[PDB]
Design a protein around this ligand. Sequence first.
Ligand SMILES: *[C@@H]1O[C@H](CO)[C@@H](O[C@@H]2O[C@H](CO)[C@@H](O)[C@H](O)[C@H]2NC(C)=O)[C@H](O)[C@H]1NC(C)=O
Ligand SMILES: *[C@@H]1O[C@H](CO)[C@@H](O)[C@H](O)[C@H]1NC(C)=O
Lengths: 33, 49
Amino acid sequence: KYRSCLPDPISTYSPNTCPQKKVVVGIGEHCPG
Amino acid sequence: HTVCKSKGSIRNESWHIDSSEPLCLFKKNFTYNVSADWLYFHFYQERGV
Ligand SMILES: *[C@@H]1O[C@H](CO)[C@@H](O[C@@H]2O[C@H](CO)[C@@H](O)[C@H](O)[C@H]2NC(C)=O)[C@H](O)[C@H]1NC(C)=O
Ligand SMILES: *[C@@H]1O[C@H](CO)[C@@H](O)[C@H](O)[C@H]1NC(C)=O
């Protein structure tokens, strides 16, 4: 599906709006992206 | 989708298109009892296994 994440997802002003949610790496897993 | 090899289907079994050999992590064959009424399977994961 189509799409703010402005200016960047790292320092976005509304983290609840940007679909790229920040998570942590678990045991036996890799970086999701 | 898949087709039936016993009788036959008007379509053709086409679910992959990779002409070369893709990278595979597991490829084995297992034989099951053909004269059986019900089959049971489990599929779960934990810690990437
Ligand atoms: C598991 O069994 C299938 C079916 O017998 C094997 O698929 C055959 O592979 C050969 C080449 O190795 C082809 O010539 C046959 O036409 C295939 N059969 C079918 C029905 O597609 C498969 O190779 C087996 N896997 C292993 C690891 O032994
Ligand atoms: C398959 O199941 C039937 C009955 O369900 C049984 O008689 C037969 O021995 C089984 N086959 C094998 C190889 O155990």
